[PDB]
Amino acid sequence: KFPRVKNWELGSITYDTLCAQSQQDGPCTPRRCLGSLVLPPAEQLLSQARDFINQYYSSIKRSGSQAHEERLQEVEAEVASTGTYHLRESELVFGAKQAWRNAPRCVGRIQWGKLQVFDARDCSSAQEMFTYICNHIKYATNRGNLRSAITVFPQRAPGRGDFRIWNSQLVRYAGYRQQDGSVRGDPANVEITELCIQHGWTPGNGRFDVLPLLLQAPDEAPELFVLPPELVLEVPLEHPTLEWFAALGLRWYALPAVSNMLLEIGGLEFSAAPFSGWYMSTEIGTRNLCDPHRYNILEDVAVCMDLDTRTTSSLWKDKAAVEINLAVLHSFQLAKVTIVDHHAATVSFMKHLDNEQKARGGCPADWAWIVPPISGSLTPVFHQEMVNYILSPAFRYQPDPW
Amino acid sequence: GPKFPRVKNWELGSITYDTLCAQSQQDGPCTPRRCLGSLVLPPAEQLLSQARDFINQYYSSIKRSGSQAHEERLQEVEAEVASTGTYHLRESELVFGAKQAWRNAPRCVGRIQWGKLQVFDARDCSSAQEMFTYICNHIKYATNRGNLRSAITVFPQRAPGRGDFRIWNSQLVRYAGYRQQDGSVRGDPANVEITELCIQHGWTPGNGRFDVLPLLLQAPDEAPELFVLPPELVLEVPLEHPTLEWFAALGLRWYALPAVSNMLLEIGGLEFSAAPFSGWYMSTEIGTRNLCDPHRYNILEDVAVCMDLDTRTTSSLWKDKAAVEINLAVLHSFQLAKVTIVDHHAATVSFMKHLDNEQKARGGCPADWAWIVPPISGSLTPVFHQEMVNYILSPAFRYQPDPW
Ligand code: HEM
Ligand code: HEM
Ligand SMILES: Cc1cc(N)nc(COCC[C@@H](CN)OCc2cc(C)cc(N)n2)c1
Ligand SMILES: Cc1cc(N)nc(COCC[C@@H](CN)OCc2cc(C)cc(N)n2)c1
Ligand SMILES: C[C@H](O)[C@H](O)[C@H]1CNc2nc(N)[nH]c(=O)c2N1
Ligand SMILES: C[C@H](O)[C@H](O)[C@H]1CNc2nc(N)[nH]c(=O)c2N1
Ligand SMILES: [Zn+2]
């Protein structure tokens, strides 16, 4: 039975029929819903391959053409003989865009057709990965006029170990574990900071020390590469009216570039395929700076604003958070670096849901991730029912390589 | 290791397994192919087995499982079903089942309080006039001049052939919503339909933004009858802001008592179609949802203008600023009027404690994440970082179709 999807603000109703194209299972069953959880042979590869080839030629209107049939035989021949096959560059470009389009947790999908795709499948060493990573950052950063991009390194092969980027993002601040349990810097990065030191990085001692990359070619120890500081664009944070805010010395980097997820296209797996767009302000201002287990700066800001910390019912937390998000937006605007606030972002996601309804008969969307972390019911997406499911091409989680 | 849902808190880094979900009899809306968790809406021996399961729950809660009193009660229940098709609850079974239904409710953040519930047994009620009396008593007891007390009143269960006891209104206290000529609504847009039914049944409509609705009460096989709550039984809080002096001039108010009246209480397969329950409010229910939903009072823009914010650009965060002050005003006004209320921070902290109590007591706690996380400041509350397993346990509060 096809899910009846309701918007509770407008009273309007759609049916998701795209979900019937899901061949991959989620965490839920009839007995118990698990959607808020954050983490989880040839014939089988061959059917994923054909389905993806089908998707591709259909995308270009050439379904059933000579080109389509010869391509299917090519894939069939390659798999039967070698247990694997390879994508053409245009197929890869199509699959990368489709993976983003299909990503249930991403609120920036209105953008999905505008993705710069660097083919790095001819990469043979960590040194080469590094040069590719640098060009990606250079291109994507674009002096603050951010552009969405993905770089795709060589696929997994039954023989050997994977190409991997050990870092979870290409740009990450160090977290230094003190002996007295506390952390200087970003607590989310304690373990990666520690790995870098193991592999011979000289650590700094600041709150915003940019980490080096740990790049690993197949069956080789990962190698260390410091990013050239001029490649990493950063925004000093200040507030439009509160002068003391700048004194906090807060900053954030411009480029959100995820570097630990696997890209699956047609049953092929790309263990290193870092990707990037631009930030939504709440990622920085709410989660990264205010999570109790991150920089956790809410009390500092509240004390500065002279708020009554002694009681929850003064909404000191809520007031501080708002000012922090505002500073992020202000400082990024002042520095001419691309950013989108959570109101503009969710408004455009609504438009996206509507495009997808017309094009595909639905849109996989994970409500808990799409609704922003402050002012939820203030945005239109809170009021919109959403159906979550896995379509392929997909970005998947994979184990940490250590 | 364990073959039950693994549940993680991402703030604390701690793990638990939910083993309670193994007691779920009723299927929910999700399947392996697709998650419908964000959707707001989903006898014979069938009765017997639900009855048996409930009686077992009862005897466990008083630690007499396998006892002679337990096996006798089971027999008494099948005997009764055997000859009538239905059965009836002892008084303390009803009290236990009502508390358990609250405790089982996945959408309620107030559940730390579940043990403390006044159960008014009203299973002798035989007319609509008498429901009105019981309801008035409930409001008087629960309101307690502002020192609010959780309560439920239980009217006679559904019976074969015979028609239902129903309260037509969705809540005991609801403000009218009048459809205007210019297509807009005066009052609360959520209440247009029930407002128009009150008028069709001979209510003389007011024309304010905060006109308290009458009750449409229906006794078995009878047309609903209309009853006006005496104004002094309905405590309201006028809204003002601690520092923004003009806020009082907005003339906004809200009622003290949240009392849900259109849900069905199901216990051991028995169906209580009229069983209103009340607690106290969490501030975001009023200040964020009721006052700021675009499809509700929708006052955000009015407040932002008074605060002199830049409403022409999303990036000023004008909505965020206004919503915060509206919530502060709700809290402050309730505090001043000495009417019980809880902020979204205190509420979620207490829910975390509830979750920990339930882990030890029952091995899990069914929880609907989207509903438990408040509608402002989500990640600022600890529940945002808590994974949750949602599933249906019984006794349960259930939705039921509108009587009309
Ligand atoms: C263009 C601007 C973009 C914006 C504003 C944006 C926004 C976001 C946001 C806010 C999240 C939530 C994740 C979190 O809370 O940490 C997210 C997740 C995600 N986005 Fe985007 N996105 C953008 C571009 C992209 C691109 C280019 C890709 C891939 C090509 C992508 C794929 C994803 C994926 C896979 C996730 C889920 C990550 C996870 O589960 O850990 N997005 N996006
Ligand atoms: C003691 C104070 C209480 C507080 C602060 C509280 C809080 C809440 C909140 C915030 C919601 C969601 C409201 C919404 O979004 O509309 C809710 C839902 C609910 N609560 Fe409570 N609650 C309380 C007492 C009770 C009591 C006494 C019962 C029943 C005996 C109850 C049963 C429910 C149920 C069944 C729902 C779900 C309603 C639905 O699905 O539409 N709660 N609670
Ligand atoms: C492309 C893009 C743009 C944008 N504005 N934001 C993003 C999202 O940032 C990604 C953060 C992701 C990491 N894969 O989600 C957080 C996370 C994921 C996992 C698996 C574990 C963990 N602790 N935290 C991605
Ligand atoms: C007892 C109680 C205390 C408290 N603080 N808050 C409440 C919540 O009020 C419940 C409102 C419920 C109605 N069943 O949610 C609104 C709603 C639900 C549904 C299914 C549809 C709809 N249009 N509107 C209940
Ligand atoms: C447990 C819960 O699902 C978890 O905290 C999720 C909720 N929603 C989220 N939404 C976004 N965008 N990012 C997140 O990290 C999370 N965390
Ligand atoms: C689509 C979505 O389920 C809907 O807007 C829900 C979201 N979360 C909610 N949470 C609560 N507490 N109350 C609600 O009415 C809603 N509405
Ligand atoms: Zn689910």
UniProtKB/Swiss-Prot annotation, chain A:
It comes from the Eukaryota. Keywords: Blood coagulation, Calcium, Calmodulin-binding, Cell membrane, Cytoplasm, Cytoskeleton, FAD, Flavoprotein, FMN, Golgi apparatus, Heme, Hemostasis, Iron, Lipoprotein, Membrane, Metal-binding, Myristate, NADP, Oxidoreductase, Palmitate, Phosphoprotein, Zinc. Its main location: membrane. GO terms for cellular component: caveola; cytoskeleton; cytosol; Golgi apparatus; nucleus; plasma membrane. Heme b binds at C106, Y397. (6R)-L-erythro-5,6,7,8-tetrahydrobiopterin binds at S36, A368, W369, F382. L-arginine binds at Q169, W278, Y279, E283, N288. Transmembrane segments: none annotated. It is found in: Cell membrane; Membrane, Caveola; Cytoplasm, Cytoskeleton; Golgi apparatus. One of its GO terms (molecular function) is calmodulin binding. Zn(2+) binds at C28, C33. Residues 32-402 are annotated as: Interaction with NOSIP. Coiled coil: none annotated. GO terms for biological process: arginine catabolic process; blood coagulation; cellular response to laminar fluid shear stress; mitochondrion organization; negative regulation of blood pressure; negative regulation of extrinsic apoptotic signaling pathway via death domain receptors; negative regulation of leukocyte cell-cell adhesion; nitric oxide biosynthetic process. Homodimer. Interacts with NOSIP and NOSTRIN. Interacts with HSP90AB1. Forms a complex with ASL, ASS1 and SLC7A1; the complex regulates cell-autonomous L-arginine synthesis and citrulline recycling while channeling extracellular L-arginine to nitric oxide synthesis pathway. Belongs to the NOS family. Produces nitric oxide (NO) which is implicated in vascular smooth muscle relaxation through a cGMP-mediated signal transduction pathway. NO mediates vascular endothelial growth factor (VEGF)-induced angiogenesis in coronary vessels and promotes blood clotting through the activation of platelets. This is Nitric oxide synthase 3.
